[PDB]
């Protein structure tokens, strides 16, 4: 079903890398390959060591852009220093959220849940949504699993 629970974040300081894709179906498409391609390179080896727990798990950030493009950040919540420059190192501003699961192999469950996600947000939470960025949030484990579990993150009001 679509539970939620409802959790608060104070501003984060985000650490990674970000790729923007023309749409929102154009990203799907292309963020398998940008984690396997993190993974290939040692940036995701890299994030972890820069990790400071703020949030338990890699982020898979969704920025919709201004002009309707989408952009994804793979990144991990950090602190901030001259260090992080090398990569994007943004700020995620406070904001209360409903966080979803989705229970399965990655990355097939998480945009099925997502896009569950979305249709439960343009019927029942129309004027209570956030235009601000949302993420899939990811803990240690066996990711290619059935009953791995993604957090989803959808900002509200409040």
């Given at each position: 079903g679509m539970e939620y629970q409802l959790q608060q974040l104070a501003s984060l300081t985000l650490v990674g890398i970000k790729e923007t894709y023309e749409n929102g179906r154009q990203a799907q498409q292309h963020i398998a390959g940008f984690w396997q391609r993190c993974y290939q390179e040692g940036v995701i080896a890299d994030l972890q060591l820069k990790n400071?727990?703020?949030?338990?798990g890699i982020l898979g950030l969704c920025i919709p852009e201004l002009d309707g493009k989408m952009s994804y950040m793979i990144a991990v919540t950090g602190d901030n220093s001259?260090?992080?420059?090398k990569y994007d190192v943004i700020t995620l501003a406070s904001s209360k959220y409903m966080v979803f699961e989705a229970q399965g192999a990655v990355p097939k469950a998480v945009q099925q849940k997502m896009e569950e996600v979305h249709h439960y947000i343009h019927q029942y939470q129309a004027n209570t949504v956030k235009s601000a960025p949302f993420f899939e949030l990811y803990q240690d484990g066996?990711?290619?699993?059935?009953?791995y579990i993604t957090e989803i993150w959808m900002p509200v009001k409040g």
């Open positions: 400071n727990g703020d949030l338990a001259a260090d992080i420059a066996d990711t290619t699993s059935e009953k």
